[PDB]
Amino acid sequence: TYDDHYNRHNYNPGLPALRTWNGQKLLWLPEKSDFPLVAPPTNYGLLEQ
Amino acid sequence: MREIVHLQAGQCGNQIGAKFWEVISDEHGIDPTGTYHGDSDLQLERINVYYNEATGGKYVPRAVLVDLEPGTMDSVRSGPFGQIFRPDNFVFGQSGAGNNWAKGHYTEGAELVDSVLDVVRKEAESCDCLQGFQLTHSLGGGTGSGMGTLLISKIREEYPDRIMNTFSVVPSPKVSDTVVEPYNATLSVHQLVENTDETYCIDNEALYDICFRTLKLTTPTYGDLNHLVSATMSGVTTCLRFPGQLNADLRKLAVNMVPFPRLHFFMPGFAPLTSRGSQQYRALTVPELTQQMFDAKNMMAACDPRHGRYLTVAAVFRGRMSMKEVDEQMLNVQNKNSSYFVEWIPNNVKTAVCDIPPRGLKMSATFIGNSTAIQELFKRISEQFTAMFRRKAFLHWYTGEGMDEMEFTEAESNMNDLVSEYQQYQD
């Protein structure tokens, strides 16, 4: 989680204004319940050395 | 200064206003995004009467959207100008309507009147000093009549010193679609007659007849009807927002149309209606405008006042006119049908001259009428109630909600009083 929010600067392929009047809750919603999962998670330099 | 705050109620008033604000915005020339394109000094001048200021030159519409059903508002927010409309102003209920008057007037309203009152006073405190309020809804509307009747009652004690403009469409006389619709009429118009000071009466059948006559386009949209009525409401509001030697304040007008308190129902009148060839076949001249202004066919409100007489006449003119063609034209019509006015009052004309023409046509006008032609209207419904109250159709719903036929007894009694009242004044 720290890597995502702080280091990875969160999810790139996401659309920025993915939050607006929705369906059931006819308001700003479809922003984030999915959360990033992609990209090398465990690839700092100390492992290879 | 003196400003106006609007309320949109009922799912019709959802479609009514949405055409009506876009009419205002395009006339003032604001883009769909909201960044005003500065072209006219005077429209930048008196925009404050209806719009407040946001950051970056965006003028917020000072109106509040109230409903119960999502889809109707879902369209308007997804509509062309929903972005300029405020989600803060989108108050709604988490329930369906059922097109039942009591549910919206006693059941659903109770938990929503608190929110809307807190809302409307917030914009009331935001602005300084109103002329009053105006409402787009329907008397034959289920949720529109149910909510408005509650709100008009509550707004009376809150601010009894302003203008209670009401814009309601009368359903089609031949068929009302809704079968319990007349019951809604009684429940609405009974309470309307006390709380309101102004009421506009609109009928769709005439709008259909107008389409056959001058539109001649066979298949219109209801939005076209929204566009037509918006032009009518816009014209009377052009008075306030635009310069020219015309006295525009609604009370400056209301005292001029209302001789006695019970006169709340008024009929509109509009200016040149044209067909496909007539645009280049018409010499835009003061007589033919006024001739077309006073045409029983150009009537659009409820029915033909030929069966009755005229109480007051008031037409406001928009274009580059002078004080004398309006002067002579009234004499011509005054001499034309002098007898069809009432001998109670002579010279009942109330004219205002707006020198700022519209965008698309130059020479225009609007007329508001109070004639002796409303009798047949409530007469028509009167036989319905005397019929359908003879054996109490559809009663178990409302009575289950807590309705009693005693309420119906006074509501009809009040209207039959108005039946004689409108009758006695002229007859």
């Binding site: - | 200064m1 001048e45 008196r46 404050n48």
Partner: protein, 49 residues
């Protein structure tokens, strides 16, 4: 025309130092403006005693 119209429209032409960045008028006019004097720049040289 809003509240306080006439001078606000008229002052911008006499006040010919408008900032370009948004909201920087206070930053620009933090030192102040020219209010306590005539619009003309110079009334010296008056050897009038």
């Amino acid at each position: 025309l809003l509240y306080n119209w006439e001078e606000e429209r008229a002052t911008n032409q006499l006040d010919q130092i408008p900032p370009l960045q948004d909201g920087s008028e206070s930053y620009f006019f933090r030192h102040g403006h020219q209010g306590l004097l005539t619009t003309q720049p110079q009334s010296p040289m008056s050897s009038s005693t």
